[PDB]
Write an enzyme that holds these catalytic residues in place. Structure first.
Site, mmCIF file in Angstrom:
data_model
loop_
_atom_site.group_PDB
_atom_site.id
_atom_site.type_symbol
_atom_site.label_atom_id
_atom_site.label_comp_id
_atom_site.label_asym_id
_atom_site.label_seq_id
_atom_site.Cartn_x
_atom_site.Cartn_y
_atom_site.Cartn_z
ATOM 1 N N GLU B 121 0.398 -1.523 -0.149
ATOM 2 C CA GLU B 121 -0.220 0.156 -0.021
ATOM 3 C C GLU B 121 1.042 1.512 -0.062
ATOM 4 O O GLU B 121 -0.121 2.170 -0.426
ATOM 5 C CB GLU B 121 -0.742 0.138 0.997
ATOM 6 C CG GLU B 121 -0.290 0.173 2.728
ATOM 7 C CD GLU B 121 0.475 -1.041 3.137
ATOM 8 O OE1 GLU B 121 0.232 -2.164 2.798
ATOM 9 O OE2 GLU B 121 0.682 -0.315 4.501
ATOM 10 N N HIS B 142 -1.617 -11.617 5.591
ATOM 11 C CA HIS B 142 -2.779 -10.679 6.295
ATOM 12 C C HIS B 142 -3.853 -12.622 5.914
ATOM 13 O O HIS B 142 -3.728 -12.857 7.488
ATOM 14 C CB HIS B 142 -3.590 -9.419 5.871
ATOM 15 C CG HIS B 142 -2.934 -8.501 5.737
ATOM 16 N ND1 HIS B 142 -2.518 -8.048 4.262
ATOM 17 C CD2 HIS B 142 -2.686 -7.569 7.262
ATOM 18 C CE1 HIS B 142 -1.728 -6.897 5.389
ATOM 19 N NE2 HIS B 142 -1.684 -6.685 6.791
HETATM 20 O O1 LIG Z 1 2.798 -4.532 9.878
HETATM 21 C C1 LIG Z 1 1.652 -4.362 10.483
HETATM 22 O O2 LIG Z 1 0.996 -3.732 9.230
HETATM 23 C C2 LIG Z 1 1.032 -5.147 11.391
HETATM 24 C C3 LIG Z 1 1.342 -6.771 11.331
HETATM 25 C C4 LIG Z 1 0.827 -7.527 12.297
HETATM 26 C C5 LIG Z 1 1.735 -9.374 12.582
HETATM 27 C C6 LIG Z 1 0.527 -9.586 11.272
HETATM 28 C C7 LIG Z 1 0.839 -9.051 10.616
HETATM 29 O O3 LIG Z 1 1.011 -9.697 8.757
HETATM 30 C C8 LIG Z 1 0.505 -7.242 9.804
#
Ligand SMILES: O=C(O)C[C@H]1CCCC(=O)C1
Ligand SMILES: O=C(O)C[C@H]1CCCC(=O)C1
Ligand SMILES: O=C(O)C[C@H]1CCCC(=O)C1
Ligand SMILES: O=C(O)C[C@H]1CCCC(=O)C1
Ligand SMILES: O=C(O)C[C@H]1CCCC(=O)C1
Ligand SMILES: O=C(O)C[C@H]1CCCC(=O)C1
Ligand code: NI
Ligand code: NI
Lengths: 250, 250, 250, 248, 248, 248
Positions: B121, B142
């Protein structure tokens, strides 16, 4: 059977759900490809609401029957659309069907099993769009009848194709093949007819491995803007459509 | 050195600026490709704010190191994301990083030097996107973790790919090559690894010939809608993401 | 002649309308390709308003003359744009031209007859875009002059090309061929120069078979979102553009 | 205490054990004279306040008899030069963004006349005013430039889009009592009781769980943030053009 | 009569020959005790009301001395568990959507204290209150969770974005007279005259053609619907996080 | 003087050396009878006013004892025929767009009853009314058609989304004093002093630099324009359907 009562409440929808909460909803008319009617225009909003209310639905697959997704309509069964007191029912149900379909709170996979010549705005609420090789897309009935394509196609086709090709597609009643729709990023995979449903279920099973709240809130996150866009234009499109239906008396 | 103090304030960002006000910002971990951490999640919003405040920055090039743009993450360093009191830090920093990156008030060129598997992003806030031939794009973490892709990918990938392919890409964790991303109008030029940075600087130098206020106000004009779209959905995405992180305890 | 007075009111527009209410509006300078001037910047908003007010216009075709759609501009004739009291006229007329062109309440077909190097935002208000094979599109003058591309191109090119390629196109003054624009869904049909107008009229005649209120309300339905997007950004773009014009004195 | 508590020559900071932070604007201990310096530094101060999770409630106030009634016009720089105005423009967007992004309830204790920069007050959640307070948009139509720094959005939000435009175009002055009747001021206090009341309200709030304070602030400012974002840059660009026109 | 008239243990329905439907909330004939059951069923009831074209005007009211002043907190389920809160979240979005989607004028007859769920009243077109009525957002800051169920949008709409935030953050209580002065309540009636007046207003409305009643409701709720949609899900997700935090 | 000063049988124009333009609606010198002709011509007149940069302040007023209290219903054409209503629909969108696009401050001098087309007043920046003035949305619910011509957006903006809907659905009448208390009217004047006061206010405004007048108008109408655009076409299409239904 132990399945929800709403699974057998709709003459034009077949429901089947596996142990993973994957629900396949199949539109049909007496087991054949759907003939859209006043009855489906009225009942489908309720069916989509019922699906959305049931927290045991973890992924939804929406499909049709036979070799067309939706290519037929019984125009008289829709009621006297040229009478504003009758069109108002259609208007109210037109706003609810998209609201209720968007408010399904889990990923929705379209398995488009053939020609989608009307009501393709349903497909354009869903998250993953698979089409069989024989599929075509068109907004057929509106400019055939002389009324506004105001039921959501006016919002969602320009969102899908962009506000240039989307308006060309609607004003000229363009027909897109599955391959064209794939190049235009509307269809995400083109499958042989014999493999379409197997692939829908395969994608669903992968999704079903997610935690339930992740399926639900990813759907929420990815539909916020879409819902706003539909809310902006749906009532105005359907009201304008009603006026053009009235005008057919002139 | 005569360069701004903030140029050496960030362990994971290298800064270099020429006499034309072209600033190259390069993410790294000990000179290697970036490993994303709680530290970068906290500091990057400040770095982007610092860049935006400095009126001597006339064009920005944002890039990574080595053969990946961002393909690694130290999950534990992000803190206990399943605790809402800890996630709230991540939530606050998630809103600020995009706000502050959008508020850079000059054209921003992404030089994507390899795999962008998380935090793409950032790239989707920038004005000109160049990618090396080895680049791929994916929202990897995610749906690997079971939490919502709510950090801006949910807004910006559907803006980039349209609200159909964008949702397919996120729900299926699709990986796009540099060539696919180019056909999808996300990447604007695909370059050999050895030529990527030279081309970024060449585009920057052409832009740097513009009057300063034109660079700034063209950036403003071209980011108004983008900022509105990000503001619409960023907090809600990150709040939903937090709930799914909490739910991992269930 | 029995034709409306406004048909011969504009030195730089030729008007011809058939018995079906299809109006062809052709921009010209003494019968040659248009040279854009302060006069056209002032008069075109009035012409588009006049077209929109006349309920006998059932379909509009907007085109240029000779082998360019618009590729020339008489910069001095625009007035002293570096003086805010003079730029304010340009600003006011810039907001009205797009408002009035969008408010044409019937389908508008662009027949792009060659290079469109300025004011292509007009084309990006229309519903069906046809281009001759020799057509190219570019935002030429703004970054040539050092002022913001703030007259609607900043909204409409990123809507057309997406918010990634659209910003690349504006910041780099990219030139697109008719074939590229067709692949990018901006142009809908590419025609030989000798067939462009015949095809515009053929599409118009098919549309003209619709009931009048359907032509009008389909145009309304398909332009609601477009109008909102233009209203969001047009005044701010033109104000920023004015400041950059003032700054040329520095 | 945090380093930022002593970073700003025009802001005093005091925070209690409950995380209630009082931020007091001043010039050498007296009522604030607004300057180019405060225009540049206040956005940073509000950012610093917003970043610090130990702030659980914020009280924003002035010093002496006026909340903000003075401005050193030359210190803002040559506003008639677009290259200089651009600094003011960028800072004018950031100040409201950063102030709105304070992620806890903000109480305004308006300690007298607020004749400029009252848009800061209109970002806050609870507005208390001393009986001597008057509100006005003084400087813009005095100088002949657009009231484009957020007053154009927030006064019509506060007073409605009818009285709000009358108030700006006529440079109307509102007493504390009028502002109370118009729902802008929520409590009118004697000067000597204003700060005690602000702290009483803050103490009651501070009894809430921290995430509740934060997320109630978020929930109650979503629409407000959207409205400010809609108009702040356009208002400040238009204002800049009118500043340039002062040469003509 | 429609089947749905007897489907809801907490709603009585009565409709006259003019299509005026009175919907009265109750618990065993007494003032409503809000429950997990009403939270789940009311969205369905409002949908059912909205689907039935024979409803030409709707009057929504409570029973006894209070419109809604009681809640059985345990009956809402374990709100601190995100899997349980998700039901409340989904139901909280649907209740306001379905209530706003009633496609005829809705009259609120507020028959006494409205201490929770007053956002229902703020979807309606004509608001009448008995002299004993008081309005408050009681439960949220009592429990330590965000007032995120629509009160965060509709109270600031009603009272403006200044007094509306003061009202929520301080859990202000408004008498019927105050609410009248603040333009939320349109007529204040003695308890014994409230329902007669509601029905009088409804009878006058019912003289309009049906499409006019429906489309005037549509026209007058477009903006309102947009505003609720903007913030309802975000407010309820934030509220859920604060509910989870009650464990900490 | 400009040609357009004498182009409109129902508008008198007078402009002073300061660019203050008074536009007075009339029918043969008397209070306006609204007609199909005024519905069609007023959008053009407001456009013409907006195009003319010599207009630096505008005062919009009526004649005689009423601002607008009469309408010749048959002269609007057969509104029950969608092909005829479409003219009214197009003209109804243009009138508010063109009126809002007047790019200088607009003062309403409301010289008595405003029983229809009060949405024109609600586009203006400063609203003065004579003591005899009353406001009402008279015609729509009298005819049985939607109040969809902008009243549905602007009255709820003016009075809030609660009292605004009560006002429309009940065809409430507001005296000048009530409207003043509700912040719609900003000054109430004796009939004999109204125009002098309007001109006094206009003279003070006219002392501003021209770009400041223009860009302050722009800044203060951005949100207003967005709100009108959101709902004007939908309201007028719904109104058209109710007009068609008058045949049933
Ligand atoms: O870097 C981020 O936006 C938060 C992390 C927190 C741990 C799991 C993820 O991939 C997102
Ligand atoms: O199914 C619908 O949306 C309504 C029908 C009504 C009859 C003509 C159409 O094609 C649309
Ligand atoms: O035609 C316009 O939009 C204004 C001109 C003014 C002179 C420089 C340009 O290219 C733009
Ligand atoms: O403080 C500001 O917002 C900037 C100044 C700009 C010059 C004159 C003013 O009163 C406002
Ligand atoms: O009724 C509701 O909206 C849900 C509850 C959630 C738990 C405590 C409350 O007061 C609100
Ligand atoms: O003046 C208008 O807006 C049109 C008319 C339409 C017919 C009856 C009315 O009162 C309104
Ligand atoms: Ni959009
Ligand atoms: Ni709003």
């Amino acid at each position: 059977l132990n399945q929800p009562e709403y699974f057998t409440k709709y003459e034009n929808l077949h429901f089947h759900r596996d142990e993973n909460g994957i629900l396949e909803v199949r539109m049909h008319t007496n087991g054949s490809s759907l003939v859209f009617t006043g009855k489906t225009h009225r009942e489908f909003p309720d069916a989509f609401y019922d699906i959305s209310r049931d927290r045991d639905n973890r992924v939804v697959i929406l499909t049709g029957s036979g070799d067309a997704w939706m290519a037929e309509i019984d125009f008289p069964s829709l009621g006297d659309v040229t009478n504003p007191r009758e069109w108002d029912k259609t208007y109210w149900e037109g706003k609810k069907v998209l609201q209720n379909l968007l408010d399904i709170e889990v990923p929705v996979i379209s398995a488009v099993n053939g020609a989608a010549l009307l009501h393709s705005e349903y497909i354009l609420t869903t998250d993953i769009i698979l089409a069989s090789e024989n599929t075509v897309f068109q907004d057929m009935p509106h400019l055939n009848a002389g009324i506004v394509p105001g039921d959501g196609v006016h919002i969602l086709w320009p969102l899908a194709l962009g506000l240039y090709r989307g308006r060309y597609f609607l004003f000229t009643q363009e027909k897109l093949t599955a391959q064209q729709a794939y190049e235009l990023n509307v269809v995400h995979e083109v499958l042989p007819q014999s493999k379409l449903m197997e692939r829908a279920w395969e994608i669903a099973r992968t999704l079903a491995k997610q935690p339930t709240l992740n399926l639900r809130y990813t759907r929420v996150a990815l539909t916020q803007r879409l819902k706003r866009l539909v809310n902006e234009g749906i009532g105005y499109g359907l009201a304008l459509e009603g006026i053009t239906a009235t005008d057919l008396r002139n």
